[PDB]
């Protein structure tokens, strides 16, 4: 028993991290097979970031201007190309530690692990959610760009995120591994509105099921609700509307606990209306939304 | 910016995990050099756990009864010995992936990363603290025994914990890598009192400094206090007494923020007396105590 904000083991991703330098800018790259993926703003100086013309900036760069270092050894760059907001540096050596991998574009509300890196070196790993507004609340300092987010299914690493920037609000924005930003963000140093963030309702319900499985049950009540009644409450509290698709994904947890999804919704409704009254759920005094129903099943069943 | 409950990258530890089976019991082992370390209760059946005589049980076991599997390959056991509550299985092959390592016995209030494993396979990594009462609030299911806790300083892994059991209260108990339990716990299936847990005051203060650095400042007040006045409040709220050693360790954070340690104590005093009034600090509605002053400096400076 016990419930923790668990990240995937990061080893398969640590073996892919490299340092990419172009001019005076250094950031992290992802080496998979004979390609190194990194944010295209590696070609910018601090002055360039205000209004960069990436096509024009990249034209002043040759293969030899991209310095790629994997640990202590230097990689030979034989090709370079821009795909959306990422640079793909073709190298002459395939990464011997390339795990089985896929590039995936995750949905808002889905979770993933982030391996924070600096100078191609891993410093830490944490679990987070892609917010409904397509930002992530990470922990990233200067030099963290190019750090990646991922999920792991047995031996296959699904890379879903590459870090690019921190908004003036302190939240983070990035791309998928094809270089397409999540959200309306652009890779420019300009004021960018993230938009209203909402709570991931299906994740809060999943976490409430995790709480019941692990013994925290004080919040269970004698009430029930309907999807429409629940959603009137969810709208007032900036929770995303719960759909029958969300109810269906909660099915296994509803089956394991014997608590109907709509009864759990009534517990959530009462918690939203009355607060926790100084109490905690799984060591938290707020409603946690960074665990998907899949994460709860996985952690409660010990999938390796 | 941003502050997360970050674990160390787990790769160096993933390369050490093995599966150990003895009879019908399977758990995780740690393979370092030519030795595999695992909980001695691997030799027990469920019936044995009520009142085991480990010396007598181990006498019925030979090297060939210990099945050690590293991924798909079987290790040859050439020696076995019990050291406190751990078994040391000498194998004929040194682990080629053995990182630079040390065995350390951490202090209560110190933090570490846990690589949760099942059948010698890693499932997740999370950061936690050794509670003042020498328990850990983990996430461990059946088969997780032998999973280890560790810290990483650049290339050196300091193993500090090996998981052994879950108390009837749902908290976890284990040993250092010499097999000495943290706390008064014994490796028997009997009711075991963990004792009063207290909040790690120096860690809460460190996390309050992390909050100020990262922009959350609403809790800063116009007050100050003394160590003695603060400790009267800490005693009432089951916080561990703050000493001048704790103040000294907060020195770098006090220097970076320009907020005197005793002024931060007065903020903590007011938070303890008045609560958060529905507000949050670093995305938490409670006072977080699982970040040491070292963790806050490390995360705020990007140590890899
Ligand atoms: O998460 C981080 C990264 C951050 N660095 C950026 O955000 C750069 C510099 C600012 O101007 C910009 C503007 C756009 C882009 Cl894509 C990057 C950047 C430093 C602190 N933490
Ligand atoms: O963290 C865990 C581990 C736990 N297994 C034990 O606690 C075993 C069996 C119970 O009786 C005992 C009693 C003592 C010892 Cl050392 C181990 C054990 C299963 C659930 N999660």
UniProtKB/Swiss-Prot annotation, chains A, B:
- Catalytic residues? 41 (for 3cl-pro activity), 145 (nucleophile)
Tell me the compartments it is located in. Host cytoplasm; Host Golgi apparatus; Host nucleus
As its record notes, the protein acts as a catalyst of: TSAVLQ-|-SGFRK-NH2 and SGVTFQ-|-GKFKK the two peptides corresponding to the two self-cleavage sites of the SARS 3C-like proteinase are the two most reactive peptide substrates. The enzyme exhibits a strong preference for substrates containing Gln at P1 position and Leu at P2 position
Crosslink Glycyl lysine isopeptide (Lys-Gly) (interchain with G-Cter in ubiquitin) sits at which residues? 5, 90
Activity regulation as described: Inhibited by pyridone-containing alpha-ketoamides compounds 13a and 13b. In turn, alpha-ketoamide 13b (tert-butyl (1-((S)-1-(((S)-4-(benzylamino)-3,4-dioxo-1-((S)-2-oxopyrrolidin-3-yl)butan-2-yl)amino)-3-cyclopropyl-1-oxopropan-2-yl)-2-oxo-1,2-dihydropyridin-3-yl)carbamate) inhibits SARS-CoV-2 replication in human lung cells. Inhibited ex vivo by michael acceptor inhibitor N3. Inhibited ex vivo by compound 11a and 11b.
Q: Residue ranges, Cytoplasmic compartment? A: 1-304
Q: Which residues form a coiled coil?
A: none
What happens after mutating residue 49 to A?
Does not affect ability to cleave and inactivate human TRMT1
Outcome following mutation: residue 189 to A: Does not affect ability to cleave and inactivate human TRMT1
Q: Which residues form the Peptidase C30 domain?
A: 1-304
Subunit record text: 3CL-PRO exists as monomer and homodimer. Only the homodimer shows catalytic activity. Interacts with host FBXO22; this interaction promotes the proteasomal degradation of nsp5.
- Tell me, what does this protein do in biology? Cleaves the C-terminus of replicase polyprotein at 11 sites. Recognizes substrates containing the core sequence [ILMVF]-Q-|-[SGACN]. Cleaves and inactivates human TRMT1, preventing tRNA guanine(26)-dimethylation of tRNAs. May cleave human NLRP1 in lung epithelial cells, thereby activating the NLRP1 inflammasome pathway. May cleave human GSDMD, triggering alternative GSDME-mediated epithelial cell death upon activation of the NLRP1 inflammasome, which may enhance the release interleukins 1B, 6, 16 and 18. Also able to bind an ADP-ribose-1''-phosphate (ADRP).
Protein name per Swiss-Prot or TrEMBL = 3C-like proteinase nsp5
Specify the species.
Severe acute respiratory syndrome coronavirus 2
- Give the source lineage, highest ranks first: Viruses, Riboviria, Orthornavirae, Pisuviricota, Pisoniviricetes
Full-sequence range covered: 3264 to 3567 of 7096
């Amino acid at each position: 028993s016990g419930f923790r904000k668990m990240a995937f083991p990061s080893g398969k991703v640590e073996g892919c991290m490299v340092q990419v330098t172009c001019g005076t800018t250094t950031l992290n790259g992802l080496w998979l097979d004979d390609v190194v993926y990194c944010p295209r703003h590696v070609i910018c100086t601090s002055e360039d970031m205000l209004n960069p013309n990436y096509e024009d900036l990249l034209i002043r760069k040759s293969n030899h201007n991209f310095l790629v270092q994997a640990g202590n050894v230097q990689l030979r760059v034989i090709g370079h190309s821009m795909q959306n907001c990422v640079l793909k540096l073709k190298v002459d050596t395939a990464n011997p530690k390339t795990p089985k991998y896929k590039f995936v574009r995750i949905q808002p509300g889905q979770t993933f692990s982030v391996l924070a890196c600096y100078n191609g070196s891993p410093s830490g790993v944490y679990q987070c959610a892609m917010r409904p507004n397509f930002t992530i609340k990470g922990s990233f300092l200067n030099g963290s760009c190019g750090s990646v987010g991922f999920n792991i299914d047995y031996d296959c690493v699904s890379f879903c995120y590459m870090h690019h920037m921190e908004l003036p609000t302190g939240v983070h924005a990035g791309t998928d591994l094809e270089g397409n930003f999540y959200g309306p963000f652009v890779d420019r140093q300009t004021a960018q509105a993230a938009g209203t963030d909402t709570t991931i309702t299906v994740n809060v319900l999943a976490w409430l099921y995790a709480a019941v499985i692990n013994g925290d049950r004080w919040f269970l009540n004698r009430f029930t609700t309907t999807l429409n009644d629940f959603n009137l409450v969810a709208m007032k509290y900036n929770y995303e509307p719960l759909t029958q698709d969300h109810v269906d994904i909660l099915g296994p947890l509803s089956a394991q606990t014997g608590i109907a999804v709509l009864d759990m919704c009534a517990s959530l409704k009462e918690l939203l209306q009355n607060g926790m009254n100084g109490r905690t759920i799984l060591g938290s005094a707020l409603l946690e939304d960074e665990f998907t129903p899949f994460d709860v099943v996985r952690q409660c069943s010990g999938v390796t």
